[PDB]
Amino acid sequence: LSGPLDALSELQLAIRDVYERQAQQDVLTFGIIIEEYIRLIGSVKQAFSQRQ
Amino acid sequence: ARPTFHITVGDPHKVGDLATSHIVYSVRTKTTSKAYKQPEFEVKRRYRDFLWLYNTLHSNNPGVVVPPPPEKQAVGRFESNFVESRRAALEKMLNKIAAHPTLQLD
Amino acid sequence: ARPTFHITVGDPHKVGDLATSHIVYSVRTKTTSKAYKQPEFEVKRRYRDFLWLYNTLHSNNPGVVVPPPPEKQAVGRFESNFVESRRAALEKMLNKIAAHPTLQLDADLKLFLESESFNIDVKHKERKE
């Protein structure tokens, strides 16, 4: 009974890790590409000010 | 040549803690570009140099673009990732600018 | 299992300058070893933890070996290379020790590699203290 309890200990530790790992896979990928654009959008605003 | 400029930004000579310490990267230009002297040069630039530089590009090119810089610590810490972002940010900035003949001409 | 312990030491969370700052590595044990709980654990150890740990291995194994540590800053700076050496030094140290069933059995080490909180709190916890 201890053993199954133990097996379910394994499932949760495993879920914790896998969840945390996915923030660095997918969310961080978007957080980088969004960050890139705000600078570049930033930059054609600097460009616009040169044209005005 | 202009886009055919080859850039590795590596070697994260990340000057150890100061709470503001500045990673110095190899910038290896392997470049077949005839807008770059050396077929390979490596320089070891530190964050400050680039930001300025980036600004320089800004300065020499009157409206003529200047994309985003090396990555900001304005949210960055000094994280490998952050510095990577910087590294990347440069890489990108650089990348593009190289495939823009003009900014590459600074 | 004992040599069949799989270790990546990565993620050079090299805590930025202090002139003594300490790189924290993922230590991913992917381990089919039945001397390591987790089939994968990652801990994020810092230099100090390991050196101690290394010493711990030294301590639990009475003559029973303990190869070289994580790499020394005693000539090292904090260089990526140096830290790599450290990373490596560990990797090696670890590698071997894992392919030595005994040093691989240090419980602190199981907890160490298979839990991030550093060697220390593991080490209290183990002698029930």
mmCIF file of C-alpha atoms in Angstrom:
data_model
loop_
_atom_site.group_PDB
_atom_site.id
_atom_site.type_symbol
_atom_site.label_atom_id
_atom_site.label_comp_id
_atom_site.label_asym_id
_atom_site.label_seq_id
_atom_site.Cartn_x
_atom_site.Cartn_y
_atom_site.Cartn_z
ATOM 1 C CA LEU A 1 0.000 0.000 0.000
ATOM 2 C CA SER A 2 3.059 2.101 0.775
ATOM 3 C CA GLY A 3 4.481 1.157 -2.647
ATOM 4 C CA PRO A 4 1.332 2.504 -4.605
ATOM 5 C CA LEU A 5 1.421 5.630 -2.497
ATOM 6 C CA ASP A 6 5.015 5.882 -3.545
ATOM 7 C CA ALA A 7 4.085 5.373 -7.199
ATOM 8 C CA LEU A 8 1.666 8.331 -7.030
ATOM 9 C CA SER A 9 4.574 10.375 -5.296
ATOM 10 C CA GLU A 10 6.437 9.687 -8.570
ATOM 11 C CA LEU A 11 3.619 10.953 -10.843
ATOM 12 C CA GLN A 12 3.475 14.376 -9.046
ATOM 13 C CA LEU A 13 7.192 14.976 -8.895
ATOM 14 C CA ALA A 14 7.299 14.079 -12.566
ATOM 15 C CA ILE A 15 4.383 16.540 -13.307
ATOM 16 C CA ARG A 16 6.048 19.314 -11.416
ATOM 17 C CA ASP A 17 9.152 19.067 -13.513
ATOM 18 C CA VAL A 18 7.422 18.731 -16.845
ATOM 19 C CA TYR A 19 5.270 21.736 -16.165
ATOM 20 C CA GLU A 20 8.157 23.934 -15.151
ATOM 21 C CA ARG A 21 10.148 22.788 -18.227
ATOM 22 C CA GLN A 22 7.380 23.854 -20.549
ATOM 23 C CA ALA A 23 7.449 27.434 -19.478
ATOM 24 C CA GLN A 24 11.072 27.534 -20.853
ATOM 25 C CA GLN A 25 9.971 25.694 -24.135
ATOM 26 C CA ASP A 26 6.949 27.556 -25.295
ATOM 27 C CA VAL A 27 6.052 30.656 -23.145
ATOM 28 C CA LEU A 28 9.727 31.967 -23.108
ATOM 29 C CA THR A 29 9.806 31.504 -26.989
ATOM 30 C CA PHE A 30 6.800 33.878 -27.247
ATOM 31 C CA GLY A 31 8.185 36.163 -24.528
ATOM 32 C CA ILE A 32 11.398 36.570 -26.507
ATOM 33 C CA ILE A 33 9.643 37.251 -29.934
ATOM 34 C CA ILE A 34 7.157 39.791 -28.367
ATOM 35 C CA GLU A 35 10.224 41.520 -26.643
ATOM 36 C CA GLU A 36 12.050 41.742 -29.946
ATOM 37 C CA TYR A 37 9.129 43.443 -31.685
ATOM 38 C CA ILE A 38 8.515 46.129 -29.027
ATOM 39 C CA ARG A 39 12.113 47.359 -29.622
ATOM 40 C CA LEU A 40 11.817 47.246 -33.428
ATOM 41 C CA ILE A 41 8.322 49.027 -33.278
ATOM 42 C CA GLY A 42 10.097 51.307 -30.903
ATOM 43 C CA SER A 43 12.745 51.906 -33.617
ATOM 44 C CA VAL A 44 10.471 52.828 -36.554
ATOM 45 C CA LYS A 45 8.988 55.396 -34.103
ATOM 46 C CA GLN A 46 12.492 56.862 -33.815
ATOM 47 C CA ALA A 47 12.645 56.726 -37.621
ATOM 48 C CA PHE A 48 9.265 58.426 -37.908
ATOM 49 C CA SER A 49 10.582 61.298 -35.746
ATOM 50 C CA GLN A 50 13.522 61.731 -38.239
ATOM 51 C CA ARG A 51 11.007 61.901 -41.083
ATOM 52 C CA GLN A 52 8.773 64.521 -39.272
ATOM 53 C CA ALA B 1 28.714 39.806 -49.084
ATOM 54 C CA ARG B 2 26.478 42.280 -47.294
ATOM 55 C CA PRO B 3 24.059 39.719 -46.014
ATOM 56 C CA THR B 4 27.011 37.276 -46.529
ATOM 57 C CA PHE B 5 28.578 38.290 -43.344
ATOM 58 C CA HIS B 6 28.897 35.446 -40.817
ATOM 59 C CA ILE B 7 28.677 36.144 -37.117
ATOM 60 C CA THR B 8 29.057 34.025 -34.092
ATOM 61 C CA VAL B 9 28.647 35.760 -30.787
ATOM 62 C CA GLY B 10 29.982 33.370 -28.269
ATOM 63 C CA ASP B 11 32.303 33.024 -25.459
ATOM 64 C CA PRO B 12 30.339 34.392 -22.651
ATOM 65 C CA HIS B 13 33.212 35.970 -20.775
ATOM 66 C CA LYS B 14 30.687 36.984 -18.400
ATOM 67 C CA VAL B 15 32.554 39.061 -16.093
ATOM 68 C CA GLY B 16 31.565 37.632 -12.720
ATOM 69 C CA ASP B 17 29.233 39.450 -10.254
ATOM 70 C CA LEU B 18 29.159 43.213 -9.518
ATOM 71 C CA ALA B 19 25.319 43.297 -9.765
ATOM 72 C CA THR B 20 25.678 45.073 -13.130
ATOM 73 C CA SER B 21 28.625 43.120 -14.647
ATOM 74 C CA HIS B 22 29.032 42.978 -18.329
ATOM 75 C CA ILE B 23 29.419 40.011 -20.489
ATOM 76 C CA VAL B 24 31.967 40.141 -23.036
ATOM 77 C CA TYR B 25 31.397 38.056 -25.982
ATOM 78 C CA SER B 26 33.555 36.978 -28.704
ATOM 79 C CA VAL B 27 32.183 38.515 -31.762
ATOM 80 C CA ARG B 28 33.566 36.532 -34.474
ATOM 81 C CA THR B 29 32.840 37.873 -37.710
ATOM 82 C CA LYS B 30 33.763 35.290 -40.272
ATOM 83 C CA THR B 31 32.788 37.308 -43.165
ATOM 84 C CA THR B 32 33.081 36.895 -46.767
ATOM 85 C CA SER B 33 31.662 40.352 -46.821
ATOM 86 C CA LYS B 34 33.803 42.878 -48.583
ATOM 87 C CA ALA B 35 32.180 45.287 -46.100
ATOM 88 C CA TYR B 36 34.350 43.565 -43.513
ATOM 89 C CA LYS B 37 38.118 43.700 -43.750
ATOM 90 C CA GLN B 38 39.019 40.506 -42.011
ATOM 91 C CA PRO B 39 37.617 37.275 -43.358
ATOM 92 C CA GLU B 40 37.585 36.490 -39.637
ATOM 93 C CA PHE B 41 37.941 38.745 -36.771
ATOM 94 C CA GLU B 42 37.124 38.279 -33.263
ATOM 95 C CA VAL B 43 36.570 41.065 -30.908
ATOM 96 C CA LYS B 44 35.393 40.757 -27.430
ATOM 97 C CA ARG B 45 32.843 43.263 -26.872
ATOM 98 C CA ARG B 46 31.184 44.246 -23.788
ATOM 99 C CA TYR B 47 27.659 45.256 -23.472
ATOM 100 C CA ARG B 48 28.313 48.920 -23.183
ATOM 101 C CA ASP B 49 30.303 49.040 -26.348
ATOM 102 C CA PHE B 50 27.545 47.581 -28.336
ATOM 103 C CA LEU B 51 24.815 49.678 -26.968
ATOM 104 C CA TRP B 52 26.738 52.652 -27.834
ATOM 105 C CA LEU B 53 27.602 51.116 -31.101
ATOM 106 C CA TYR B 54 24.063 50.409 -31.770
ATOM 107 C CA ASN B 55 23.433 54.003 -31.080
ATOM 108 C CA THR B 56 26.305 54.824 -33.406
ATOM 109 C CA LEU B 57 24.536 52.990 -36.133
ATOM 110 C CA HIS B 58 21.667 55.064 -35.127
ATOM 111 C CA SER B 59 23.845 58.143 -35.413
ATOM 112 C CA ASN B 60 25.380 57.548 -38.791
ATOM 113 C CA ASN B 61 22.287 56.574 -40.450
ATOM 114 C CA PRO B 62 19.922 59.573 -40.308
ATOM 115 C CA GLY B 63 16.559 57.891 -40.430
ATOM 116 C CA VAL B 64 18.130 55.004 -42.164
ATOM 117 C CA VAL B 65 17.273 52.326 -39.728
ATOM 118 C CA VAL B 66 18.736 50.914 -36.661
ATOM 119 C CA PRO B 67 16.875 47.946 -35.539
ATOM 120 C CA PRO B 68 16.638 47.004 -31.563
ATOM 121 C CA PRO B 69 20.246 46.712 -29.677
ATOM 122 C CA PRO B 70 22.080 44.053 -27.541
ATOM 123 C CA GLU B 71 19.562 43.027 -24.835
ATOM 124 C CA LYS B 72 18.438 45.207 -21.990
ATOM 125 C CA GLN B 73 19.003 44.577 -18.410
ATOM 126 C CA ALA B 74 15.954 46.861 -17.873
ATOM 127 C CA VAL B 75 14.132 43.657 -17.116
ATOM 128 C CA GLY B 76 17.162 41.400 -17.587
ATOM 129 C CA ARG B 77 19.182 40.411 -14.607
ATOM 130 C CA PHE B 78 22.417 39.121 -15.755
ATOM 131 C CA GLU B 79 20.929 35.722 -16.480
ATOM 132 C CA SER B 80 22.642 33.416 -18.979
ATOM 133 C CA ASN B 81 19.385 33.683 -20.775
ATOM 134 C CA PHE B 82 19.331 37.432 -20.463
ATOM 135 C CA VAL B 83 22.873 37.721 -21.608
ATOM 136 C CA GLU B 84 21.922 35.258 -24.234
ATOM 137 C CA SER B 85 19.187 37.588 -25.115
ATOM 138 C CA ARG B 86 21.773 40.189 -25.343
ATOM 139 C CA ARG B 87 23.978 37.981 -27.368
ATOM 140 C CA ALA B 88 21.062 37.150 -29.511
ATOM 141 C CA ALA B 89 19.911 40.713 -29.602
ATOM 142 C CA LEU B 90 23.089 41.654 -30.937
ATOM 143 C CA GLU B 91 23.183 38.721 -33.132
ATOM 144 C CA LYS B 92 20.010 39.745 -34.575
ATOM 145 C CA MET B 93 20.730 43.374 -34.653
ATOM 146 C CA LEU B 94 23.945 42.631 -36.292
ATOM 147 C CA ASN B 95 22.532 40.015 -38.493
ATOM 148 C CA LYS B 96 20.099 42.281 -40.003
ATOM 149 C CA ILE B 97 22.297 45.178 -40.254
ATOM 150 C CA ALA B 98 24.716 43.088 -42.038
ATOM 151 C CA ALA B 99 22.014 42.091 -44.438
ATOM 152 C CA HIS B 100 21.369 45.676 -44.869
ATOM 153 C CA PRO B 101 24.343 46.888 -46.649
ATOM 154 C CA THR B 102 24.335 50.441 -45.026
ATOM 155 C CA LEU B 103 24.336 49.766 -41.303
ATOM 156 C CA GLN B 104 26.895 47.170 -42.071
ATOM 157 C CA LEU B 105 28.970 49.971 -43.574
ATOM 158 C CA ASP B 106 29.425 51.865 -40.361
ATOM 159 C CA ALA C 1 22.422 1.046 -13.459
ATOM 160 C CA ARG C 2 25.432 2.073 -11.409
ATOM 161 C CA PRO C 3 27.526 3.114 -14.337
ATOM 162 C CA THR C 4 24.114 3.467 -16.122
ATOM 163 C CA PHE C 5 23.510 6.774 -14.592
ATOM 164 C CA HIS C 6 23.202 9.606 -17.133
ATOM 165 C CA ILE C 7 24.357 13.089 -16.261
ATOM 166 C CA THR C 8 24.241 16.341 -18.048
ATOM 167 C CA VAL C 9 25.690 19.288 -16.230
ATOM 168 C CA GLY C 10 24.500 22.267 -18.110
ATOM 169 C CA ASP C 11 22.827 25.506 -17.771
ATOM 170 C CA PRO C 12 25.583 27.697 -16.673
ATOM 171 C CA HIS C 13 23.553 29.928 -14.401
ATOM 172 C CA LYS C 14 26.684 31.626 -13.797
ATOM 173 C CA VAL C 15 25.807 34.019 -11.223
ATOM 174 C CA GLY C 16 27.211 37.262 -12.609
ATOM 175 C CA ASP C 17 30.332 38.998 -11.175
ATOM 176 C CA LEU C 18 31.297 39.291 -7.474
ATOM 177 C CA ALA C 19 34.933 38.272 -8.227
ATOM 178 C CA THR C 20 34.200 34.875 -6.638
ATOM 179 C CA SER C 21 30.672 34.201 -8.012
ATOM 180 C CA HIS C 22 29.450 30.712 -8.302
ATOM 181 C CA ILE C 23 28.031 29.009 -11.253
ATOM 182 C CA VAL C 24 25.064 27.026 -10.748
ATOM 183 C CA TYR C 25 24.560 24.268 -13.093
ATOM 184 C CA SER C 26 21.692 22.167 -13.860
ATOM 185 C CA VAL C 27 22.634 18.747 -12.854
ATOM 186 C CA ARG C 28 20.333 16.600 -14.667
ATOM 187 C CA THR C 29 20.583 13.158 -13.724
ATOM 188 C CA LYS C 30 18.639 11.129 -16.211
ATOM 189 C CA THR C 31 19.331 7.897 -14.639
ATOM 190 C CA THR C 32 18.182 4.493 -15.215
ATOM 191 C CA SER C 33 20.203 3.782 -12.151
ATOM 192 C CA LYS C 34 18.263 2.220 -9.345
ATOM 193 C CA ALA C 35 20.825 4.050 -7.183
ATOM 194 C CA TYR C 36 18.980 7.191 -8.230
ATOM 195 C CA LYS C 37 15.350 7.700 -7.310
ATOM 196 C CA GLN C 38 14.247 9.921 -10.120
ATOM 197 C CA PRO C 39 14.665 8.679 -13.655
ATOM 198 C CA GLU C 40 15.356 12.382 -14.184
ATOM 199 C CA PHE C 41 16.079 14.998 -11.726
ATOM 200 C CA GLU C 42 17.535 18.301 -12.126
ATOM 201 C CA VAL C 43 19.123 20.182 -9.375
ATOM 202 C CA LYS C 44 20.947 23.365 -9.700
ATOM 203 C CA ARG C 45 23.996 23.125 -7.766
ATOM 204 C CA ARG C 46 26.448 25.691 -6.963
ATOM 205 C CA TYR C 47 30.084 25.181 -6.710
ATOM 206 C CA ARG C 48 30.234 25.197 -2.979
ATOM 207 C CA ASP C 49 27.665 22.500 -2.643
ATOM 208 C CA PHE C 50 29.583 20.170 -4.782
ATOM 209 C CA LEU C 51 32.901 20.728 -3.232
ATOM 210 C CA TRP C 52 31.452 19.947 0.021
ATOM 211 C CA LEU C 53 29.615 17.107 -1.504
ATOM 212 C CA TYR C 54 32.714 15.822 -2.991
ATOM 213 C CA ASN C 55 34.168 15.977 0.422
ATOM 214 C CA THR C 56 31.073 14.199 1.684
ATOM 215 C CA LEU C 57 31.812 11.387 -0.658
ATOM 216 C CA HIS C 58 35.180 11.569 0.817
ATOM 217 C CA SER C 59 33.634 11.390 4.266
ATOM 218 C CA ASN C 60 31.314 8.473 3.794
ATOM 219 C CA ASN C 61 33.720 6.346 2.075
ATOM 220 C CA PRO C 62 36.594 5.683 4.505
ATOM 221 C CA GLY C 63 39.455 5.073 2.138
ATOM 222 C CA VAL C 64 37.011 4.015 -0.451
ATOM 223 C CA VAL C 65 37.844 6.506 -3.088
ATOM 224 C CA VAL C 66 36.840 9.939 -3.953
ATOM 225 C CA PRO C 67 38.285 10.981 -7.170
ATOM 226 C CA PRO C 68 39.196 14.909 -7.882
ATOM 227 C CA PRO C 69 36.101 17.497 -7.274
ATOM 228 C CA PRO C 70 34.296 20.232 -9.337
ATOM 229 C CA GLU C 71 37.094 22.476 -10.698
ATOM 230 C CA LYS C 72 39.215 24.786 -8.628
ATOM 231 C CA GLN C 73 39.334 28.452 -8.887
ATOM 232 C CA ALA C 74 42.811 28.116 -7.278
ATOM 233 C CA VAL C 75 44.096 28.837 -10.740
ATOM 234 C CA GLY C 76 40.654 29.230 -12.326
ATOM 235 C CA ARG C 77 39.182 32.643 -12.665
ATOM 236 C CA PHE C 78 35.586 32.314 -13.307
ATOM 237 C CA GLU C 79 36.189 31.679 -16.985
ATOM 238 C CA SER C 80 33.557 29.839 -19.028
ATOM 239 C CA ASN C 81 36.330 27.409 -19.581
ATOM 240 C CA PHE C 82 37.180 27.294 -15.917
ATOM 241 C CA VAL C 83 33.600 26.858 -14.954
ATOM 242 C CA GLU C 84 33.455 24.377 -17.729
ATOM 243 C CA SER C 85 36.334 22.718 -16.098
ATOM 244 C CA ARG C 86 34.317 22.733 -13.026
ATOM 245 C CA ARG C 87 31.337 21.440 -14.839
ATOM 246 C CA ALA C 88 33.495 18.860 -16.410
ATOM 247 C CA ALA C 89 35.270 18.156 -13.188
ATOM 248 C CA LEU C 90 32.123 17.389 -11.680
ATOM 249 C CA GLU C 91 30.983 15.590 -14.661
ATOM 250 C CA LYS C 92 33.900 13.439 -14.433
ATOM 251 C CA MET C 93 33.901 13.112 -10.747
ATOM 252 C CA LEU C 94 30.324 12.241 -10.892
ATOM 253 C CA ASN C 95 30.686 10.100 -13.887
ATOM 254 C CA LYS C 96 33.123 7.895 -12.296
ATOM 255 C CA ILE C 97 31.531 7.775 -9.018
ATOM 256 C CA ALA C 98 28.421 6.750 -10.654
ATOM 257 C CA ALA C 99 30.288 3.981 -12.361
ATOM 258 C CA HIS C 100 31.508 3.042 -9.030
ATOM 259 C CA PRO C 101 28.513 1.772 -7.329
ATOM 260 C CA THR C 102 29.565 2.966 -3.762
ATOM 261 C CA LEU C 103 30.247 6.665 -4.177
ATOM 262 C CA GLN C 104 27.125 6.712 -6.212
ATOM 263 C CA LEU C 105 25.359 5.359 -3.137
ATOM 264 C CA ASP C 106 25.995 8.373 -0.986
ATOM 265 C CA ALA C 107 22.455 9.295 0.101
ATOM 266 C CA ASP C 108 23.321 12.935 0.293
ATOM 267 C CA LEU C 109 24.327 12.529 -3.259
ATOM 268 C CA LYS C 110 21.048 10.935 -4.186
ATOM 269 C CA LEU C 111 19.199 13.713 -2.598
ATOM 270 C CA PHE C 112 21.705 16.204 -3.965
ATOM 271 C CA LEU C 113 21.329 15.195 -7.584
ATOM 272 C CA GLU C 114 17.798 14.414 -7.242
ATOM 273 C CA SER C 115 16.727 17.408 -5.314
ATOM 274 C CA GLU C 116 17.740 21.046 -5.655
ATOM 275 C CA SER C 117 18.309 22.574 -2.249
ATOM 276 C CA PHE C 118 22.007 21.976 -1.984
ATOM 277 C CA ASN C 119 24.085 19.423 -0.186
ATOM 278 C CA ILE C 120 23.582 21.081 3.089
ATOM 279 C CA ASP C 121 19.978 20.678 3.917
ATOM 280 C CA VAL C 122 20.134 17.240 2.528
ATOM 281 C CA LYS C 123 22.922 16.589 4.873
ATOM 282 C CA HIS C 124 20.985 17.514 7.917
ATOM 283 C CA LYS C 125 18.079 15.612 6.815
ATOM 284 C CA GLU C 126 19.948 12.458 6.286
ATOM 285 C CA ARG C 127 21.450 11.793 9.756
ATOM 286 C CA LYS C 128 17.946 12.551 10.940
ATOM 287 C CA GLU C 129 19.085 15.925 12.091
#
